[PDB]
Structures are given as structure tokens and as C-alpha cells.
């Protein structure tokens, strides 16, 4: 129903080498379609999805010169930030940038994003109103005053509400067979006795799309999350995703526990019980 | 203050000859642009650069190539000069705020099929009418530059050895009377008491920009280089 | 798409009257517009921005209000002065390309003329002493609302009106200059027909 377009930017300064590392990736939902690496031989924007390949030379040469400017911007940003926090040039630092847009089940604009991070911590972020900036510290205020004077937020809105959305709609149409599909999870339960009095029940969810899924364990009809092990959703490597949840269960009381799977391509939420 | 410079300020070239336009900028800007202006109308982008050693094509790149050796310099190169490349070329500069662009002084370039047509002006100074002096108590000296090709001229008035701007009206555009010759005129008006004074020396200077020393020229005719041609008259009681 | 349309050619205005220079544009998404002024023998420079608030921006003076509904960004001023005589560019900063750049229009030339309170139109004949039989006719001190004739005859050339200002006290005078290659001529007939 609802879809998204994302661009992730990573710039890491390398004191040991001559040039800082820059990596830029583009995502439509949970599928990667473009990449750019500063240490790559080609020095061009690279297709990663099958459906993005149908774009002409006009697109690729334009996206190449754009990401190169993005790379150049973040190289300067590394030097600007080290001066803000008064840090030495001997230490490595990471600048993370993310921007993109969300559409609803009607393919209309819902949310827009534009945010930065320095060494893991938040720096500057565009608010939900698309007119405001959130500065984390006093060094972020200097950036905030630069962008408010240049009216960058107003320039950004034209991209997020327009260009980001209309190109996302173009991608969804071109990759109809891949992006508009919905895969239902294959579910099964596995059992392992950890001790003479306890046992682990694992609730598997395999081969599903998109990655967004909910796995909850219940004891006697009540949500148990205090004694639940949940792993990060992992890609299979073909377009589908995988995830599981585990609980510590006293021996003989395995049937008192239930797993609940919620997915978009699933007509009804499934209840799973050990037998 | 953000200042952009260009060199040369004036250039005359032949069809099928190499032309190089330089642009220097000392504002610490990453973005530099090359525009062209045609007959006082339109400003079209030719090439641009966002970083050193990298150049991007603009709106009209055909027949033009550019080079960015450093942050300060951005060159526009013409390998084969054509008649359609006759324009006034401006060089712009900006930071990441790319909508506020700072421009250079400009460069007038004229490309010609032949070189013989290039000719210096003939400056004639016209003396005020005595009917004007007896009625309005003012005298109007008129300067007239005629028979010059490429219209790369700068007119200046000189009274008593000093360059004056008082009571001066030069023509903004050079009037084309023939295909291979331009014309330009200017007025200098002073009081009747000032003109009637024999001490006062009036002079009309026309700075003509022609060919450089690196240009080939036949042995017969004198080479029409960058030269100053003046006409002068003194006060009469 | 991505276009700017300005007032074509020369706009002649008398000093004191309000300035109006039109600019319409085509754009794909929510854009921003700018006015660039270029005086004679000078570099083009930014005059005013479209920011700030709902349509209204502007500096020197000069001001412009953005109307996104009809895509208009007309340049305005309350009272024109002689110094406003310049070429004016309306520019569209690309809202969303692969690379954002300014798109300039064809440019509108503003020519503000002086208000001559006491006109004294007169035609004079001037001579060149260094040469023989060479003459010149001057038309000066006339109203800014009359038309200066253009050349229709070969050999005879007439120039457009220009303004000189003396450092006395507001001695502003319009002027037209004409000359001919012919031996037989008349200064009394050359500056005829507004």
C-alpha cells in the first residue's frame, strides 16, 4: 500500500589515506536500485535493480554529476564539522545523511525527510512541517542559520513534495512486477531443550516482502515481551526477508505459549502453537 | 567584496582560429560559470564547474570547451571559431548558494572571415555654433568617430589635460553606417565664458581595440593595433 | 518547460512615474525567481529575491511580489529616476533538475527619460576646421516626448537621442546628431517628423 524512496549518504574521513570514503545508496522501499562508491573504478552512478536499467543516458549522466557534487559537499562537510567541534585531523569521523519521501496507499505525499548525523549522534533534521529545523547543539545552530538565510527548507520542499514523489511513482510503475508485489511469510515453529527444566521455542517467518513484519509472543493470551529474544530483520539475498523470535519456556508448558505473525500480504494474523 | 576578473577584455579573432578566455576569482567559491550575451539580450549558459579538474556542459555547449585547472581559474576555449560565436562573454561565480552569482566585467569577442576589414577610427572634432553661444550662453562641442571596424572602442573627453565626466554624453551603442565600418559620437557642453577662453584646451580621445602583436599582417598596409586617436581645438574669444 | 518570458525590447519611461517590467514563467515545481540588473559597461548583479514571505521580496526602491497562481514576478518601483537606466534580467532558479541552475530571460531594457520643464528646441550647424566642406547638424534642448527621425537616405545618418547633464544646476538636455556624405544638404529639414 504505502511506499517510500530513500537516499543514504555515508562519508568517512581517512587520516591514513589521501581521500575520504564516500558511499551513496538509493532505496525504493526495501529494494536497492542505485549505488555510488568513491573507491570504485567507474566513478559513476551504478544500477542495482533490474527496473532502473530502463532509464536513458539523460538520467545516468545527470545522477552521476549530482552524486559527485554530493560527494564533494560531504568532503567539505567533514572539514567544516571538525572546525565546529574543535577536533584534530588525526582522528577519523563519520558524517551520515538521509533524505527521502513517503507516499500512502493512494500514492500521495505523506512525510518528507532530511537529516544528518555526526559520529552517531544527531546533528540537524527537518521537522514534520517541512519548514522547521531541529538543531541538536550549538555547532548545529551555525548550520541552521546558514540554511534559514538561504531558504534551503523552501527549496527542499519542492523536491520532497514534487520530484521525490513523482520519480517514486515512476519507479513503482516501471518496477511493477517487483515493487508492487506482496509475499506472504512461510511460518514454522522449532523446539530445543536448553536444560532439564527449560526449553526454547523459536517462531520462524521466511520468504516475505516487504521487510515490515510483527512477531509477538503471548502467554495465556497476554503479550510477553519481558522474556523475548528478537533478531533484526535479515535479507535472504533474492528480494525476500527473514525473521524469528524466541522465548524461554519451562518444560511441559510449551503449549501455553503462542506466536502471532502480522504481515501486509497476510489476509489474517496467524496464531502458532507448538504440538 | 566578491570580485571576478576576466582576460582579455576585448579580442578580435579569425574564423578557424584558437581563442582562449580566462577568468580569475579570489572569493573561495567552488562554483564557476561561463555565460554569453547576444546584442544586449539573453544570457545563456555554456559550461560550468562545481569543483577543480571537472567541467560540466551547460545549455549550449556545442563549439565550446572549458577547463578548470584550479579553484581560482576557469577557462573557456574555442578550438574552431565561427561567425555565430560573436558575443559578449560573462564569467560568473558562486558558492553552494548558486542563485546568488557574482559576475565578471565581460569580454567582447568578434570573429571575422577576413582580417583586412579591421580599420582604425578617424576622429574629427566639430566646433560649436555661434548662434548657440549668443542665445543660450552655452557651447556644445561634438566629437565624431568614423570609419572604424570592430566596434571595440572607448570614448573619453579631455579638458585642460584632465579626463572630464561633467556635461558629457557618449552614445551607448556604436552606430553601424556600413557593413564593415562603425560610427560613434559624443557631446561636450560648457559655459560661453569657458569656450571663449583661449587658455582652455579641448580634446576627444577614442581608445580603439584592434589586433595583437601575435597576429599576421601583410607588409603593405599598417597593422591596426590597439591605438589612441584624438582631435583637438582651442578656445576663441 | 522551465522558461522565462519578459517584456520584449525597450521600455521608455518618464522620471517620476512608476516602473513596471513584466516576467512570466513556466515551471514544473514550486520555484524561486530573481531579478538581475546590468548597467551600461558594468557587470550584471543581483537586484532582489523572491523570498522572505508569501510572494513579496525586493531591495533598492525596487520590489517584486511573486504570484504562483498565474506565475508572475513583475518588477516594480514607486518613482523612477534617471539612474534606473539599465538592462534588467528576470531569472528562474531551477526548482528541480539534476543540477540546479539559473535560467535567464531575454532581458528588458529600461530607458528613463528626463522631464524637461522649459524646452528650447534648436538646430545648429557645426563645422570641422581640419577638413574641407565637412559639416554636421545638431538638434538639442528638446522635449523627451518628441520622436527623433531615423535614416531613410543613403549617405545621411541620424543618431538616437541622448541626454547630457551639466554640473551647473539641472541643465539636462536631449541631443540628436546627424551628418551626410552629400554636398547639398539642409539642417532645417533633417530632424523633421516626430
Amino acid at each position: 500500500g504505502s511506499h517510500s524512496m530513500r537516499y543514504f549518504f555515508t562519508s568517512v574521513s581517512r587520516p591514513g589515506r589521501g581521500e575520504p570514503r564516500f558511499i551513496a545508496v538509493g532505496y525504493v522501499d526495501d529494494t536497492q536500485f542505485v549505488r555510488f562508491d568513491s573507491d570504485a573504478a567507474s566513478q559513476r552512478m551504478e544500477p542495482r535493480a533490474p527496473w532502473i536499467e530502463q532509464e536513458g543516458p539523460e538520467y545516468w549522466d545527470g545522477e552521476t554529476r549530482a552524486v559527485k557534487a554530493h560527494s564533494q559537499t560531504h568532503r567539505v562537510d567533514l572539514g567544516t564539522l571538525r572546525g565546529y567541534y574543535n577536533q584534530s585531523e588525526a582522528g577519523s569521523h563519520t558524517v551520515q545523511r538521509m533524505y527521502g519521501c513517503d507516499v500512502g496507499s493512494d500514492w500521495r505525499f505523506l512525510r518528507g525527510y532530511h537529516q544528518y548525523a555526526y559520529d552517531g549522534k544527531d546533528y540537524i533534521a527537518l521537522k514534520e512541517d517541512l519548514r522547521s529545523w531541529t538543531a541538536a547543539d550549538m555547532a548545529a545552530q551555525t548550520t541552521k542559520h546558514k540554511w534559514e538565510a538561504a531558504h534551503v527548507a523552501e527549496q527542499l520542499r519542492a523536491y520532497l513534495e514534487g520530484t521525490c514523489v513523482e520519480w517514486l511513482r515512476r519507479y513503482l510503475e516501471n518496477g511493477k512486477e517487483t515493487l508492487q508485489r506482496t509475499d506472504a511469510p512461510k511460518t514454522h515453529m522449532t523446539h530445543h531443550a536448553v536444560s532439564d527444566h527449560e526449553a526454547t521455542l523459536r517462531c520462524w517467518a521466511l520468504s516475505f516482502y516487504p521487510a515490515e513484519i510483527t512477531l509477538t509472543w503471548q502467554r495465556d493470551g497476554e503479550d510477553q515481551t519481558q522474556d523475548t529474544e528478537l533478531v533484526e530483520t535479515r535479507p535472504a539475498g533474492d528480494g525476500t526477508f527473514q525473521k524469528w523470535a524466541a522465548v524461554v519456556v519451562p518444560s511441559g508448558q510449551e503449549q501455553r505459549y503462542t506466536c502471532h505473525v502480522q504481515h501486509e500480504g497476510l489476509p489474517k494474523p496467524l496464531t502458532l502453537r507448538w504440538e | 567584496e566578491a570580485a571576478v576578473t576576466q582576460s582579455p577584455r576585448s579580442k578580435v579573432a579569425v574564423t578557424g582560429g584558437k581563442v582562449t578566455l580566462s577568468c580569475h576569482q579570489t572569493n573561495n567559491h567552488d562554483y564557476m560559470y561561463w555565460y554569453r550575451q547576444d546584442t544586449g539580450h539573453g544570457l545563456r549558459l555554456i559550461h560550468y564547474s562545481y569543483v577543480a579538474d571537472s567541467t560540466e556542459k551547460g545549455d549550449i555547449p556545442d563549439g565550446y570547451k572549458a577547463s578548470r585547472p584550479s579553484q581560482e581559474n576557469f577557462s573557456l576555449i574555442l578550438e574552431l571559431a565561427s561567425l555565430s560565436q560573436t558575443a559578449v562573454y560573462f564569467c560568473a561565480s558562486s558558492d553552494w548558494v548558486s542563485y546568488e552569482q557574482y559576475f565578471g566585467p565581460g569580454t567582447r569577442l568578434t570573429v571575422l572571415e577576413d582580417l583586412r576589414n579591421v580599420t582604425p577610427p578617424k576622429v574629427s572634432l566639430f566646433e560649436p555654433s555661434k548662434a548657440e553661444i549668443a542665445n543660450k550662453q552655452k557651447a556644445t562641442l561634438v566629437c565624431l568617430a568614423r570609419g572604424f571596424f570592430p566596434d571595440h572602442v572607448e570614448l573619453s573627453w579631455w579638458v585642460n589635460g584632465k579626463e572630464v565626466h561633467s556635461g558629457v554624453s557618449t552614445d551607448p551603442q556604436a552606430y553601424k553606417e556600413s557593413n564593415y565600418s562603425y560610427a560613434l559620437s559624443s557631446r561636450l557642453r560648457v559655459s560661453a565664458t569657458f569656450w571663449h577662453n583661449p587658455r582652455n584646451h579641448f580634446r576627444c580621445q577614442v581608445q580603439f581595440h584592434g589586433l595583437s602583436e601575435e597576429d599576421k599582417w601583410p607588409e603593405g598596409s599598417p597593422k591596426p593595433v590597439t591605438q589612441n586617436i584624438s582631435a583637438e581645438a582651442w578656445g576663441r574669444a | 518547460m522551465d522558461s522565462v518570458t519578459q517584456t520584449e525590447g525597450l521600455v521608455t519611461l518618464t522620471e517620476g512615474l512608476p516602473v513596471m517590467l513584466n516576467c512570466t514563467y513556466q515551471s514544473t515545481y514550486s520555484p524561486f525567481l530573481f531579478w538581475y540588473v546590468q548597467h551600461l559597461n558594468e557587470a550584471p548583479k543581483l537586484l532582489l529575491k523572491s523570498f522572505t514571505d508569501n510572494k513579496r521580496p525586493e531591495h533598492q526602491g525596487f520590489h517584486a511580489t511573486l504570484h504562483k497562481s498565474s506565475s508572475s514576478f513583475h518588477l516594480q518601483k514607486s518613482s523612477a529616476q534617471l539612474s534606473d537606466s539599465a538592462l534588467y534580467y528576470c531569472a528562474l532558479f531551477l526548482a528541480s533538475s539534476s543540477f540546479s541552475k539559473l535560467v535567464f530571460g531575454q532581458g528588458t531594457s529600461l530607458s528613463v527619460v528626463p522631464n524637461i520643464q522649459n524646452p528650447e528646441p534648436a538646430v545648429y550647424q557645426l563645422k570641422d576646421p581640419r577638413s574641407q566642406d565637412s559639416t554636421l547638424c545638431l538638434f538639442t534642448d528638446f522635449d523627451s516626448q518628441i520622436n527623433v527621425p531615423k535614416t531613410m537616405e543613403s549617405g545621411t545618418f541620424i543618431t538616437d537621442k541622448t541626454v547630457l547633464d551639466m554640473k551647473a544646476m539641472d541643465s539636462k538636455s536631449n541631443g540628436a546628431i546627424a551628418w551626410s556624405n552629400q554636398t547639398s544638404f539642409t539642417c532645417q529639414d533633417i530632424f523633421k517628423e516626430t
Binding site: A69, V76, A150, L156, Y159 | - | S97, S100
Partner: peptide, 9 residues
């Protein structure tokens, strides 16, 4: 498609 405007920090 990428954003055509590149603001620095």
C-alpha cells in the same frame, strides 16, 4: 532521482 541543490553544513 537525486536532489539538484547541494547545501553545505
Amino acid at each position: 532521482a537525486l536532489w539538484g541543490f547541494f547545501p553545505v553544513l
